């Protein structure tokens, strides 16, 4: 009977309006002994606003019960740690997992937008590039848009540990070749803690 | 028990020696002994290279086999079965591996110069976008003046929306080396590429 612990989504914590939550998934408890008690601890202080939600079978014959705790944006951001104590009877001792933000100096992502190579203009779809380097920690969130409306054909690479201990990532946005050729401005929106207001944005259009 | 593919570069260069490894973490002092029957497309092979058995410290060892595959064999999608007979197990464990099936596609390679906004700095970013390839085994490298570069980092391959993959490679040079006009080059090595190897250049305009 194994147990997992997941951080809040980046976006959740850096937007006061949203609700960040750590999840304590428990895959594999057995029919034999079903019962599970979730004592949540925050910086050690036991919390009681647990949200142990029910309970879902599967196609391997073992359950999966999940808890959820709502963290404060600040609590998480300031590096507090969330302990999940999972008491079952298939185990001699209750399993534990601690999680928290990544320690160390948060650093401001730099954001450069990179136009399509000349060599791609042969095509009828074109690549816009957003290079976001220099950040820490690696929780971050990138999105594309134009004319105030969002874009949906973009994909983003994972954050890569750069040589200086910071992270980079790229975002590629794929538009029709004409939309660029005319002069539409497009924008890359980054959202990261070490950004002023947790959010910057760079633009990009034909010259 | 685990099973690892040859490195991309090994298979796409006739001169190198691609090899699948059958790592076995965790056998116990109690019962040490392990026999490695390798099978290729089912046909049992006997050029096994079971390399020695190194009783690791957590009282669990780790014995490794190695098989040398032919470049062809791998590239044509043959499958490599590893059958690991121990006595802590009732039945011998199995793992099969092979290349990824599916139409290999030629990577397009575009080199992208530094944003204007980075010229404030004293180190500058060169970008190599390599999109459209399949399978995702690929190898990217940077160089200039025929000599190699060493300050570059590369993102994993990302599953693009059309089933193909992209990745980017960032090379970090001093701001002057660019400002002057040094050509730099991104070297990609992938199966669907003619001669398994293309290369694009990049310099100040
Ligand atoms: C007792 O000790 C031994 C070793 O003793 C040591 O004790 C001290 C002294 C220290 O030295 C310690 O280092 C060490 O603990 C322990 O043995 C370890 O056991 C674990 C599992 O029990 C193994 O983990 C696996 O690791 C692989 C990948 O690891 C690569 O990179 C590692 C470096 O971080 C390296 O350790 C590995 O050797 C390996 O490196 C590659 O080597 C090959 C072979 O030559 C080479 O070609 C490559 O060059 C090289 N790689 C490169 C390029 O760098 C990991 O992939 C495994 O994960 C699979 O299984 C997981 C569950 O166990 C699962 O969660 C994962 O999802 C994954 O399953 C797969 O998932 C991927 C998704 O991407 C995908 O393939 C599939 O979806 C799925 N596969 C399928 C379909 O099944 C795995 O975690 C360690 O390798 C091993 N350590 C050693 C020595 O390698 C042992 O743990 C101890 N005893 C106990 C009780 O724990
Ligand atoms: C029978 O069925 C179930 C379910 O079927 C499963 O899913 C279906 C769809 C098929 O693909 C099946 O093949 C597959 O089996 C099986 O249940 C599985 O149980 C295993 C092990 O117990 C789990 O493996 C782990 O995977 C987690 C990752 O889980 C996240 O992502 C998953 C997919 O992305 C998702 O399923 C999870 O819900 C979760 O996703 C997140 O969910 C949260 C909220 O819950 C949400 O906030 C997020 O939005 C969402 N995230 C997103 C976007 O995806 C992973 O944590 C584990 O990896 C660690 O542990 C391994 C130990 O073996 C180790 O080898 C790994 O390398 C890795 O090690 C960790 O490393 C990190 C840093 O590298 C370190 O911090 C940790 O300390 C270290 N942990 C260690 C050492 O323990 C692990 O790989 C499966 O996720 C789980 N499947 C599902 C769907 O839940 C079941 O096993 C089957 N029966 C069998 C075969 O026994």
From Swiss-Prot, chain B:
Keywords from the UniProt entry: Adaptive immunity, Cell membrane, Chromosomal rearrangement, Disulfide bond, Glycoprotein, Immunity, Immunoglobulin, Immunoglobulin domain, Membrane, Secreted, Transmembrane, Transmembrane helix
Phenotypic consequence of residue 83 to A: Does not affect binding to FCGR1A. Only slightly affects binding to FCGR2A and FCGR3A. Impairs binding to complement component C1q. Impairs complement-dependent cytotoxicity
GO molecular function: antigen binding; Fc-gamma receptor I complex binding; immunoglobulin receptor binding
Domain of life: Eukaryota
One GO BP annotation of this record: antibacterial humoral response
Protein's UniProt keywords contain rRNA-binding: no
GO cellular component, as recorded: blood microparticle; extracellular exosome; extracellular region; extracellular space; IgG immunoglobulin complex; immunoglobulin complex, circulating; plasma membrane
Post-translational modification: Glycosylation on Asn-58 is required for interaction with Fc receptors and ability to activate the complement pathway. (Microbial infection) Deglycosylation on Asn-58 by S.pyogenes EndoS or Endos2 endoglucosidases prevents interaction between immunoglobulin-gamma (IgG) and Fc receptors, impairing ability to activate the complement pathway.
Region of interest called CH2, as start-end residue ranges on this chain: 1-101
Glycan attachment positions: 58
Region of interest: CH3: 102-205
Disulfide bridge positions per record: 22-82, 128-186
Keyword Metal-binding: no
Residue intervals of the Ig-like domain: 1-98, 107-203
Assembly, per entry: Immunoglobulins are composed of two identical heavy chains and two identical light chains; disulfide-linked. Interacts with FCGR1A; this interaction mediates IgG effector functions on monocytes. Interacts with FCGR2A and FCGR3A.
Role description: Constant region of immunoglobulin heavy chains. Immunoglobulins, also known as antibodies, are membrane-bound or secreted glycoproteins produced by B lymphocytes. In the recognition phase of humoral immunity, the membrane-bound immunoglobulins serve as receptors which, upon binding of a specific antigen, trigger the clonal expansion and differentiation of B lymphocytes into immunoglobulins-secreting plasma cells. Secreted immunoglobulins mediate the effector phase of humoral immunity, which results in the elimination of bound antigens.
Disease: Multiple myeloma: A malignant tumor of plasma cells usually arising in the bone marrow and characterized by diffuse involvement of the skeletal system, hyperglobulinemia, Bence-Jones proteinuria and anemia. Complications of multiple myeloma are bone pain, hypercalcemia, renal failure and spinal cord compression. The aberrant antibodies that are produced lead to impaired humoral immunity and patients have a high prevalence of infection. Amyloidosis may develop in some patients.
Record-given protein name: Immunoglobulin heavy constant gamma 1
Organism: Homo sapiens (Human)
First and last residues shown, out of full length: 123 to 327 of 399
